[PDB]
Design a binder for these strands. Structure first.
Ligand SMILES: [Mg+2]
Ligand SMILES: [Mg+2]
Ligand SMILES: [Mg+2]
Ligand SMILES: [Mg+2]
Ligand SMILES: [Mg+2]
Ligand SMILES: [Mg+2]
Ligand SMILES: [Mg+2]
Ligand SMILES: [Mg+2]
Ligand SMILES: [Mg+2]
Ligand SMILES: [Mg+2]
Ligand SMILES: [Mg+2]
Ligand SMILES: [Mg+2]
Lengths: 70, 145, 206, 62, 143, 148
RNA sequence: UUAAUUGCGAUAACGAACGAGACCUUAACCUACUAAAUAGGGUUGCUGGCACUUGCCGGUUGACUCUUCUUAGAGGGACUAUCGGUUUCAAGCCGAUGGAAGUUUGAGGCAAUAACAGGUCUGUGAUGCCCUUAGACGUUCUGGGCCGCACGCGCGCUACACUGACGGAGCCAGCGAGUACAACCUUGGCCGAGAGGUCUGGGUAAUCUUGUGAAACUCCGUCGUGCUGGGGAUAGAGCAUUGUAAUUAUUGCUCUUCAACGAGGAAUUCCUAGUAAGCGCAAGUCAUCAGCUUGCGUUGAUUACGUCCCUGCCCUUUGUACACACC
RNA sequence: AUCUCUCUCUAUGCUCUCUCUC
């Protein structure tokens, strides 16, 4: 990945609007669909999960299993 | 954990202590790129400074960087004893020093020169281009110069 | 459903009809749809194992290998290449994650999807180095069911392995994706492609 | 094109390397045919065997 | 009906205890907190600056509660692990010997861990009470 | 990422002459990259690699090197190439080589521009190489005509 | 037929003897027997804690009671048993049931005849013979040397990273081995940031070290496609330790130094179930040092159950201008 | 009367020798 380890405002907005429609949400997924690549993606995911937005399925760390609200 | 998005304030790729410090490596691990600076001790330095490790390379404000530099170059005053730094005890001053960037190599060179002058075994080996620290050259070191 | 009163603390899920119906760690071991005719006692299903981790004897008879749960077999196959020889717990965890991914993406009971993938990857026509003097001659030989299934499983695992070798994608997700591809939709997964190539090769030879 | 036939009896095992089985295949669609087929791998009696090959058959493997 | 230390999950409990310790004023920290690697069999010191030694203390307390006659050496053996000798296969090396001792001393000062006239350290009644309280808190957090 | 096929359409045709750079040997033959058509993976099944029995595999074919080839089986759905080396006739070989060279030259032309300005590669391919090909047959011929 | 010159049987052969098998040694099964502060329970005292109405979790050499686990000892157990078919229905085999177990139950240990011109006089006071025998090839002291390095092979280890690494925090093993006419394994309490010191005791043994709280693993993190926190070679500099003696780093520990190395050509080894591999540990050597062996034990796959194609082997027949026997 | 039917290169090699007592 060509850097892309920034919690940029535009990037955040994109994430907000692209995490729905798609059923599966993960760090790997984010990396694939070109936004954040690596460590700060996890942080972003965490801060999307305060109340609602994306619902958890995983009860496990390292691999994240998350589905948007239907 | 940080929810802060941050605007255009951090400038990536920094020129610190002459040697180029690269972008978005985790402060400690950004400092490691500089010679003389190494992992654990970098971390310790950071801790001493009182900057949070979970930050970007460009994130660091100038003052913090300055403090870090000070900690590195003058180590003894900020509670860093012997089992800590590069040239412990030393051969030239008696005081211990945490040599950096373009100093350690120079010191090494000086040592080599002295050895050569005084024709010691290690020095001889170095002159030759041979393995010093207990190795059997029956197999060891076929890469050459 | 029906809370059993104990001095020891037991979770609600356990109390509920999991005592009544014994299907998986909260997944359907029912449905039961094998697309090809019969194929049972070669792809196991039926026996509702809770967690894909059973210590038994599945090498000590000719066909007894079949009575391994398919998920368990998958886990075992995943358990491969230096860094991961032994450590079946890890494999089990990965399988669980894969299942979760499947559930998330394109819904359905994941077990059925897995079964479909197993069916639709594996080859009908195969090649053996018969020789003809030891040279490059390979007669087209049709494959036995159990063996074919095993091969398919192996190739699925291989695909995942290939994907994971220096990548952001954690093994499980990748595996799930490839499984889905194999089942039906795109058929751009590695394993399925390989199988098809093999079949083609077999066809052009006798 | 898709065909499938049940196995009933094994006509031994043949091959320079070996391992590859000679089988007697009976078609579940019309039981009038019992053909000599090459099968790779572990195979017993009463198994459904998918065949991409329709009519071609061989006995010995050399 | 009630609670004890054995019946409550490990890591969560430990973290709760650590949090409690942090909240509390008395701890008696060394002059070398997060300067040591906690193990000579370890390569890099602990992360997230503040605490971690607290966590270790909590863990030690838990261990003491579980057993009866545990000394410094045994605790050291318990912690640490495989030291990356690099090119040479990794042998099991014990933790940093003094750190555990310091932790024990701190606990003694707080009044949670005492000594038995057989050899080693055992739990104090106050300590037991504290542990029980922590367990209760953890239970509350869960449900 | 840099990609896109050598010719006009996405997928290769039956009995198309190609040049194959050898990647790695497996079981069927080799998973080669076709240098006359994109970089789509295909295989030479062990029967049609050479005219005669030559015993050695790493002297007449060779890993890393290019081989004069022809496409036998193509499946216009996803991506499979059943390939031959033997079915290439005497002579013919020279022609194939020439074609390969032409293709290489074409490829060389289309990258400098990209380097100078990024922008989508597919678009570039569309606006430089394809219409001419459609009009005649090959891009190198068109280039030659232009030069003349 | 069988792993088997293992059987059954045809029978100028009959009755044999080794060998195999049996046999030992252990590993599994014995809620059967004998038993047990040097092995664990059980109830109750004696208390500690939280619920409190009984209770749960412990501590304590308090009694007393046993013995399922831990130890052993006598013994027993499976013999292919029971059917199902197949086979001159004999020899046996594959499948099913029951069983702790049905591959000779797994693995060993002993291993025949005949040799090899295999290996060693560098295990010996096991020696023939030849030599040197007093400035000695005997002997010991001092110091090197076997550890040298343009290279070429053979073992092994670490890696080439996300199933990762790095932090925490979970927490679980079996073989051992260990003190006297010497200086062992070392606990527990204070030193040091590690290594390692130090006063003490326990243990010349199921007790003490040691439940060897072992790794790998397990959970919460941190890092995130990068020769990059992957790799730790090579170099510096310093603190201890063993030893009369560490330079040609003995080793250990702290530091900094960060190369080759993106899963490996042609080639070839090893393996068919607690096996392969991963992972440790102890022992042997040992004053100090394991990347080594030898034994354990954790974690535990994939694919065969077959053929003679390559590589051998076994017998039978066959052909040999070969017996130094196809080299 | 029941067979069924497989396949190719591969060159050479120099270091002895042995009986007893009836
Ligand atoms: Mg019977
Ligand atoms: Mg035996
Ligand atoms: Mg002699
Ligand atoms: Mg002399
Ligand atoms: Mg030597
Ligand atoms: Mg060896
Ligand atoms: Mg490291
Ligand atoms: Mg590693
Ligand atoms: Mg034990
Ligand atoms: Mg690095
Ligand atoms: Mg030595
Ligand atoms: Mg000859």
């Amino acid at each position: 990945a060509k850097h892309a380890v920034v919690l940029d405002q535009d990037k955040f907005d994109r994430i907000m609007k692209e995490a729905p429609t798609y059923r599966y949400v993960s760090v790997s997924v984010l990396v694939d669909r070109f936004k954040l690549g690596g460590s700060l993606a996890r942080v972003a995911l965490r801060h999307l999960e305060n109340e609602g937005i994306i619902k958890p399925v995983s009860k496990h760390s390292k691999q994240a299993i998350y589905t948007r609200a239907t | 954990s940080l929810v802060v998005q941050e605007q255009g304030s951090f400038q990536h790729i920094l020129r610190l202590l002459n040697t180029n410090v690269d972008g978005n490596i985790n402060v400690v691990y950004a400092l490691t790129t500089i010679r003389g600076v190494g992992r654990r001790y970098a971390n310790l330095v950071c801790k001493k400074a009182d900057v949070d490790l979970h930050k970007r390379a460009g994130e660091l404000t100038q003052e913090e960087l300055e403090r870090i530099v000070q900690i590195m170059q003058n180590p003894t005053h900020y509670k860093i004893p012997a089992w800590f730094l590069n040239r412990q005890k030393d051969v030239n001053d008696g005081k211990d020093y945490h040599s950096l960037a373009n100093n350690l190599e120079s010191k090494l060179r000086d040592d080599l020169e002295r050895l050569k002058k005084i024709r010691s075994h290690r020095g001889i080996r170095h002159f030759w281009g041979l393995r010093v620290r207990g190795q059997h050259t029956k197999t060891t070191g076929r890469r050459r110069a | 459903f029906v809370p059993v009163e104990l001095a020891t603390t037991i979770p609600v899920e356990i109390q509920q009809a999991q005592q009544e119906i014994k299907l998986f760690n909260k997944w359907s071991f029912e449905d039961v749809e094998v697309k090809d005719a019969s194929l049972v006692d070669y792809i196991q299903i039926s026996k509702p194992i809770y967690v894909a981790h059973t210590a038994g004897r599945y090498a000590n008879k000719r066909f007894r290998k079949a009575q391994c749960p398919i998920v368990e077999r998958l886990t075992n196959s995943l358990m491969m290449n230096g860094r991961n020889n032994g450590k079946k717990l890890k494999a089990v965890r990965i399988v669980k994650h894969t299942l979760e991914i499947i559930n998330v993406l394109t819904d359905q009971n994941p077990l059925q999807v897995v079964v479909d993938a197993i069916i639709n990857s594996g080859p009908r026509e195969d090649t053996t180095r018969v020789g003809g003097g030891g040279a490059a001659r390979r007669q087209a030989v049709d494959v036995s069911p159990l063996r074919r299934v095993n091969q398919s499983i192996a190739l699925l695992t291989i695909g995942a392995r290939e994907a994971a070798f220096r990548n952001i994608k954690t093994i499980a997700e990748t595996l799930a994706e490839e499984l889905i591809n194999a089942a039906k939709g795109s058929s751009t997964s590695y394993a399925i492609k390989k199988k098809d190539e093999l079949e083609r090769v077999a066809k052009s030879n006798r | 094109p898709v065909t499938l036939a049940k196995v009933i009896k094994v006509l031994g095992r043949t091959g320079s390397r070996g391992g590859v089985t000679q089988v007697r295949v009976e078609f579940l669609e019309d039981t009038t045919r019992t053909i000599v087929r090459n099968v790779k791998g572990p195979v017993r009696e009463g198994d459904i065997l998918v065949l991409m090959e329709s009519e071609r058959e061989a006995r010995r493997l050399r | 009906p009630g609670v004890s230390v054995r019946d409550v999950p490990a890591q969560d409990f430990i973290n709760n205890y650590a949090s409690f310790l942090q909240r509390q004023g008395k701890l008696e920290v060394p002059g070398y907190v997060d300067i040591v690697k906690t193990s000579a069999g370890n390569e890099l010191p602990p992360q997230d600056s503040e605490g971690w030694f607290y966590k270790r203390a909590a863990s030690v307390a838990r261990h003491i509660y579980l057993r009866k006659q545990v000394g410094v050496g045994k605790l050291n053996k318990l912690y640490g692990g495989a030291k990356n000798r690099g090119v040479r296969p990794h042998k099991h090396v014990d933790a940093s010997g003094s750190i555990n001792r310091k932790v024990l001393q701190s606990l003694e000062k707080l009044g949670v861990v005492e000594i038995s006239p057989k050899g080693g350290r055992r739990i104090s009644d106050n300590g037991l009470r504290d542990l029980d309280r922590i367990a209760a808190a953890t239970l509350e957090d869960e449900e | 990422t840099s990609h896109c096929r050598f010719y006009e359409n996405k997928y290769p045709e039956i009995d198309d002459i190609v040049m194959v750079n050898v990647q790695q040997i497996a079981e069927m033959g080799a998973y080669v990259k076709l240098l006359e058509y994109d970089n789509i993976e295909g295989m030479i099944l062990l029967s049609e690699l050479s005219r005669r029995r030559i015993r050695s595999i790493q002297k007449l074919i060779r890993v890393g090197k290019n081989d004069v080839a022809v496409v036998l089986r193509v499946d216009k759905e996803k991506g499979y190439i059943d390939l031959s080396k033997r079915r290439v006739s005497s002579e013919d070989i020279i022609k194939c080589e020439e074609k390969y060279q032409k293709s290489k030259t074409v490829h060389s032309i289309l990258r400098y521009c990209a380097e100078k300005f990024q922008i989508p590669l597919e678009e570039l391919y569309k606006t430089i190489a394809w219409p001419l090909s459609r009009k005649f047959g090959h891009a190198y011929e068109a280039f030659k005509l232009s030069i003349i």
